[PDB]
Design a protein around this ligand. Structure first.
Ligand SMILES: OC[C@H]1O[C@@H](O[C@H]2[C@H](O)[C@@H](O)[C@H](O)O[C@@H]2CO)[C@H](O)[C@@H](O)[C@@H]1O
Length: 207
């Protein structure tokens, strides 16, 4: 399949962080203002004036020079959350400075695009976007509303837990701006499930 991407980090509780979003063992973990895991999956989102924010460990990272693991807010043409929550997809970039690189990402939230295959990649400092839960969480992140910061050095003022994800963007990712990609759903690697805690019942069917 073919799709396009954007990047973001709004500190909001992930949509797949609520129970009943799909056949899973447990939904995606949420974190408190101090980036620590929360036990209550029914907690109010930090973007709804509540205490449930996005976990900093739900950041992208490089496995090797050709592959990275990550997370994204997804929207698939003619599909619903039930079919993508916690599902993993192997993306192979077809444009940008990272063309040819692969990245396996787990869907932890939902984007607002309709009629398209869109992956809004979780990237600290990639842009708060529509919602801003980072201001309530810890005073906010620097950068333009969409797209976020423009220089790696800007990651220096970020809360410690968000720095590596922020920097990953200017390293493995070579600051690629909205690269397009081909993608197929694949079984979620153990490392991703270990970060979110969420695994789909139909996951084993994939390879
Ligand atoms: O709780 C209202 C509504 O929330 C949806 O999840 C939110 C998430 O909590 C928020 O942090 C993010 O920024 O937006 C999404 C979508 O509004 C959830 O998916 C719904 O089931 C729930 O009723």
């Amino acid at each position: 399949a073919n799709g396009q991407s954007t990047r973001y980090w709004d500190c909001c509780k992930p949509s797949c962080g609520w129970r009943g979003k799909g056949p899973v063992n447990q939904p995606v973990y949420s974190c408190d203002a101090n980036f620590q895991r929360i036990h209550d999956f029914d907690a109010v989102s930090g973007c709804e004036g509540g205490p449930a924010f996005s976990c900093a460990d739900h950041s992208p990272w490089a496995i090797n020079d050709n592959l990275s693991y990550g997370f994204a807010a997804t929207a698939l043409s003619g599909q619903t959350e039930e079919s993508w929550c916690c599902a993993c997809y192997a993306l192979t970039f077809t444009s940008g400075p990272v063309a040819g690189k692969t990245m396996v990402v787990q869907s932890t939230s939902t984007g607002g695009d309709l009629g398209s295959n869109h992956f809004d990649l979780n990237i600290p400092g990639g842009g708060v976007g529509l919602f801003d839960g980072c201001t309530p969480q810890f005073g906010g992140l620097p950068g333009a509303r969409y797209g976020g910061i423009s220089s790696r050095q800007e990651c220096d003022s970020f809360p410690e837990p968000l720095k590596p994800g922020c920097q990953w963007r200017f390293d493995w990712f070579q600051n690629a701006d909205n690269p397009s990609f081909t993608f197929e759903r694949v079984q979620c690697p153990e490392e991703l499930v270990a970060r979110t805690g969420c695994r789909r019942h139909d996951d084993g069917g994939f390879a």
